[PDB]
Amino acid sequence: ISFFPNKPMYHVQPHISFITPERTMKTIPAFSRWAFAAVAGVFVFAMQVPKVKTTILQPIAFIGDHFKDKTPEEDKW
Amino acid sequence: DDLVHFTLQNWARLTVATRAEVERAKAQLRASLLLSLDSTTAIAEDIGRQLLTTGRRMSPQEVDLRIGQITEKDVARVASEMIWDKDIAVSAVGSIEGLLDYNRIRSSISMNRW
Amino acid sequence: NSWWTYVNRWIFSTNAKDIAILYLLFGLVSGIIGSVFSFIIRMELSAPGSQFLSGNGQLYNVAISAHGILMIFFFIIPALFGAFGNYLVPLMIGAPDVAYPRVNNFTFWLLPPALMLLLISALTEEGPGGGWTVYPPLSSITSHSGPAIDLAILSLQLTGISSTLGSVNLIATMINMRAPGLSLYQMPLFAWAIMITSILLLLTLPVLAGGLFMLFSDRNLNTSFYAPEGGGDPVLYQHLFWFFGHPEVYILIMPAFGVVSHIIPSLAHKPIFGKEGMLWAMLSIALLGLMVWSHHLFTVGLDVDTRAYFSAATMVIAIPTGIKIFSWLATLTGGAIQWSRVPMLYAIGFLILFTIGGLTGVILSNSVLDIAFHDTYFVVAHFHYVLSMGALFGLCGAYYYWSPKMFGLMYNETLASIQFWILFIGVNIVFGPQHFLGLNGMPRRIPDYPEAFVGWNFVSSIGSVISILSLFLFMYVMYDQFTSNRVVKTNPYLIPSYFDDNVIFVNEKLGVAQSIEWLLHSPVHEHAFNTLPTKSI
Amino acid sequence: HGVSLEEINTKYNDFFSNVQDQFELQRGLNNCFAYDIVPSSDVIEQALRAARRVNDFPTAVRIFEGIKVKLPTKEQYQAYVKELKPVCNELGIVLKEDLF
Amino acid sequence: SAPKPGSTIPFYINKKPLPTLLYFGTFGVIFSIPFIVVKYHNRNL
Amino acid sequence: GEAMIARPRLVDLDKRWGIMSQEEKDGLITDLYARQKQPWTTLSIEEKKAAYWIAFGEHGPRAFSHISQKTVFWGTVAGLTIGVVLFGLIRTQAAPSPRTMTREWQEKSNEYMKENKINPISGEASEGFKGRGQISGGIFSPSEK
Ligand code: HEA
Ligand code: HEA
Ligand SMILES: CCCCCCCCCCCCCCCC(=O)OC[C@H](COP(=O)(O)OCCN)OC(=O)CCCCCCCCCCCCCCC
Ligand SMILES: CCCCCCCCCCCCCCCC(=O)OC[C@H](COP(=O)(O)OCCN)OC(=O)CCCCCCCCCCCCCCC
Ligand SMILES: [Ca+2]
Ligand SMILES: [Mg+2]
Secondary structure (H helix, E strand, O other): OOOOOOOOOOOOOOOOOOOOHHHHHHHHHHHHHHHHHHHHHHHHHOOOOHHHHHHHHOOOOOHHHOOOOOOOOOOOO | OHHHHHHHHHHHHHHHOOHHHHHHHHHHHHHHHHHOOOOHHHHHHHHHHHHHHOOOOOOHHHHHHHHHHOOHHHHHHHHHHHHOOOOOOOOOOOOOOOOOOHHHHHHHHOOOOO | OHHHHHHHHHOOOOOOHHHHHHHHHHHHHHHHHHHHHHHHHHHHOOOOOOOOOOOOHHHHHHHHHHHHHHHHHHHHHHHHHOHHHHOOHHHHHOOOOOOOHHHHHHHHHOHHHHHHHHHHHHOOOOOOOOOOOOOHHHHOOOOOOOOOHHHHHHHHHHHHHHHHHHHHHHHHHHHHOOOOOOOOOOOOHHHHHHHHHHHHHHHHHHHHHHHHHHHHHHHHOOOOOOOOOOOOOHHHHHHHHHHHHHHHHHHHHHHHHHHHHHHHHHHHOOOOOOHHHHHHHHHHHHHHOOOOOHHHHOOOOOOHHHHHHHHHOOHHHHHHHHHHHHHHHHHHOOOOOOOOOHHHHHHHHHHHHHHHHHHHHHHOOOHHHHOOOOOEHHHHHHHHHHHHHHHHHHHHHHHHHHHHHHOOOOOOHHHHHHHHHHHHHHHHHHOOHHHHHHHOOOEOOOOOOOOOOHHHHHHHHHHHHHHHHHHHHHHHHHHHHHOOOOOOOOOOOOOOOOOOOOOHHHHHOOOOOOOHHHOOOOOOOOOOOOOOOOOOO | OOOOHHHHHHHHHHHHOOOOOHHHHHHHHHHHOOOOOOOOHHHHHHHHHHHHHOOOOHHHHHHHHHHHHHOOOHHHHHHHHHHHHHHHHHOOOOOHHHHO | OOOOOOOOOOOOOOOOOOHHHHHHHHHHHHHHHHHHHHHHOOOOO | OOOOOOHHHOOOHHHHHHHOOHHHHHHHHHHHHHHOOOOHHHOOHHHHHHHHHHHOOOOOOOOOOOOOHHHHHHHHHHHHHHHHHHHHHHHOOOOOOOOOOOHHHHHHHHHHHHHOOOOOOOOOOOOOOOOOOOOOOHHHOOOOO
16 A cells, blocks of 8 residues: 555655656746746837837837937828 | 765755755654664763753753744745855865866856746 | 634624734725825826826816725724724733624624715716815715715715714723723723714714705705705805814824824823823813814804804914823833833824824914915825824724734734834825925815925925835735744733732732733733722722 | 832832842842832842852843843943952852853 | 634634735735626726 | 863853753753853953853844845835836827927917016016026927927
8 A cells, every 4th residue: 555664754756767746846946937038039029110119118218219200290201 | 976966966056945855854853853863972972062052952851842833934035044055064085087167067066037 | 614613703703803914904905005095196287287187187086085994094093093903902801702783793884885885986987076075065966976976975974974883882981891890981092082983973974964965965866955946055055064074184183092092101101190080171171172172164154153163262272282292201201211102102293293293283273374275285285193193093003003913923023113114204205395395375185286386296296206115115024924923921911010029920920910901911801801800999 | 109219129129128029129129120229239149149049040141131121321230340259159050141 | 522722713724834925816806806897887888 | 060161061152052952951041150150360261251142142032033134225226216117108198199299389478478567576687587487398398390
């Protein structure tokens, strides 16, 4: 009934090879941080695409001033 | 180089140590601290050293209580405080040509995939 | 089968201890709903113009009226006036139970149906629209058609009569069940205050009962009680309402006075300065807070002599309160202070907020001065900065101070202190800008405002948001305290003096306290005071 | 009002002239250190004799610790220790700052 | 009857894994009631 | 109590005291009580240290909890920033602002009420008036889209 009869405080747990639940519970913050870093990098590399500027960047206050078009009435033909 | 790299990797892994390994180490240490004393000379030497370095000799009850309190979180904290990326001291004698430089040896004390 | 035992211990039980906990829980479930209502109304006025809504002014009136009524009559009165009295007054008087257990059991259960019927009334096609102070012509069948405000009138009626019925047994309990050798003069200050509030409430509320019933009869029996064409004068309604409204806030805030006067000494390890003078000044306040009622009718247009008579006497209220604050200041100095304790933190933060609110109250007690601030945001700032800074702080301090006695658990000091700081900052930056908004000459109860006011509303909205996180942290800390199994000794607030040995104090000094409640085990027995404690006659 | 400044000094010296119980000694010693009245040389000396009589060591060093805490400046404490050194050396009293 | 209280008067059993969701759901619904209240007045509009 | 108590019995007392069982505690207290009967001159320094630590120590009754004030400060800062961020995030989902919230209309009104001497004392029609007046500035008065 028990893996170690002399010490019942030892239970085996479901696993595949070493993907036991405790290891994943320890791992989760690393995945969260890596995903956040990847998202930040992707956002950094696409901060000048016109669609991104006109959808996300400008509605943000304070910083929204910088990411505009300042050309007066003298503009595209 | 492979041996040193794997040794330092197993050193650095101690920040995510599991409960079972800690329990096994606790049992082994508790057994080993008592299996050594098997002669009058050994007991006298142990008593003398304990009195000279600390000031008193710890009774087995106190040792057992001190060891039992240790858990895996304490091990993780201590490892992250002293075993994680930190200065090390090396000493080599013999045909040590295969040993790499200091920086490559030190680079294995921390794992980058965390 | 513990189900019968379950419902006999909770529903068919008349013990005082098993009821005050339900008082606290009912107060909490009312307060959460009220705080969310306040959050939604403050988020409406973040920026000018219709916002998150289709310009529904009647909906905004319903929201403000519901917030006011439910947070003034379902949050603070039932969870402070009788919640911390019925549990604690028998402990300090020297009695095992209240005088009439059955009426004590009955009073609590009149409130849940009141809450349900108030919610149903607010869930009508129109809902109450007269605000916290509903007025006859607006309430007239001409404006509202339906069972919207009649149920609110009924809720106010039944809640008032229940509170009156919940205060008859208390006075008898603390006037006849006194300990042998406990003169009424030698009574502790907290029970003194609670008895003063009980007598004032019982003396005044019947007037509300009669006036509210006769005003409500206008909608059904078509009486001419207040009809302008029927010979009724609504100024009579205002006089009747403000013969009650003015002392209501004092009877709500006196338990805060008592709890502060109890928190200060024990955590300061110093007896309270001038007990007799303080209690006699508080009695003077209690007697004084009845003959002044027309300060709420300054711009209605009454006569000069009446205005002078009822405006000159508004100032004399300040003197005893200033004496009380000075006495507490004197008590604080000299003696030891543990400023890191959460009850001490709340007690210290109470004083400055209460005194600045009192200064704001003495600002607008003149007919020459009220004309520039009557029914503007300045009175909102005054009454909010007094109510939510005094009564709420007193309730929080009382909870954090007597919680181990109610249950027998320990909370987290770090989270409690963080919650206190966050709440203090939020409530300080919420009612701050409103002072300027009312000083500019802009009225209250307006979902829309002229454009030159946006900045201060924007500054208030962030603090309103912060208060919600404060509430969340309080909920988390309450849950943690309830399920942390942290034991508590008999008198956790007793420490050895500067010359008490660590072996002498532990064995020949335990079981001593400034008050009775700390002598018993933190989870108190069902049948305490088997024999009456006898003092020096 | 009640007792004046010096009267309580004389009264507490008289009380500490004869104390045989540790609890009473600590009680009177607590009640003395609350009138803003730093004990005179006779009062502290008699308290030390009483502590010697009732056979309690840590009370003696607690006396000097409390006097150092209560006194306003370092000069008064230095004068007190200078005028009371022989007693402490006679009764084998070790100060806190030199104890560890 | 002379029972000794266990310093536990919570009106309902509490423990870590299961009851947390029930407590949080009750808190959420009693927090979000005003929402349905404000939605009801603007249903047919 | 006449023989001197061994030093290895009264060394590093503070660390050992918690783990040490009750019986050793009573034995040490009784031994020190019997010891203090003798004149205090004959006693060693470690005996005095142990006696004082036993009496006016930190263990037992006067063992208070310590609260990390830095934790409170950081928690307050985190709560404030979370509130600000959440309010900003739920801010954008509001109804569109009135058309009069534009810089152009604000300045037009500013030059308008000056003509009709509306507050010329120290307000909208002051002699110098470098200040704004009827402009909130910042996000409240953005440029025309
Ligand atoms: C919560 C409790 C509470 C308390 C304690 C007070 C305290 C006071 N209140 Fe207030 N008040 C309310 C609750 C309270 N009020 C509410 C809810 C309303 C609105 C009603 C509604 O519309 O529904 C209201 C409204 C209100 C008005 C109506 C204004 C308007 O709408 O037109 C007036 C006017 O006189 C007033 C006066 C006072 C006065 C003089 C005090 C005095 O007690 C204050 C005295 C305290 C001090 C002054 C500070 C301490 C004193 C000293 C330091 C001494 C030295 C001071 C000086 C010499 C300056 N109150
Ligand atoms: C009981 C008194 C009381 C309390 C506590 C409050 C609390 C608050 N009130 Fe209210 N209010 C009134 C009494 C009160 N109010 C009255 C009488 C009116 C007039 C009604 C009318 O005009 O008809 C009114 C109206 C009113 C308006 C009028 C709308 C308008 O004129 O435009 C506004 C708007 O700003 C407002 C805001 C607030 C805010 C932001 C809070 C609070 O958010 C401030 C911070 C407080 C908290 C966030 C709650 C903290 C709670 C706890 C931590 C839980 C503790 C629980 C226990 C342990 C049991 N109130
Ligand atoms: C607010 C103004 C309204 C009028 C005031 C009266 C309110 C209702 C009457 C309540 C009794 C008052 C105290 C009596 C003395 C006393 O205490 O009677 C004693 C008992 C309690 O004490 P005991 O048996 O434990 O004593 C121990 C004996 N040795 O009372 C009762 O069991 C009350 C009976 C239950 C009635 C509650 C329902 C109330 C209905 C209200 C609706 C009717 C009025 C509607 C008005 C529009
Ligand atoms: C609007 C503001 C205007 C302020 C105007 C007020 C001016 C007069 C007030 C000063 C009188 C008290 C001073 C003590 C004199 C004395 O020496 O009293 C004698 C006693 C000495 O102790 P004893 O009795 O045991 O002596 C025994 C003799 N055998 O002192 C005390 O116990 C002081 C203890 C209580 C006083 C604490 C004061 C706390 C603040 C007071 C108000 C602060 C005002 C803040 C706003 C300015
Ligand atoms: Ca709005
Ligand atoms: Mg008005």
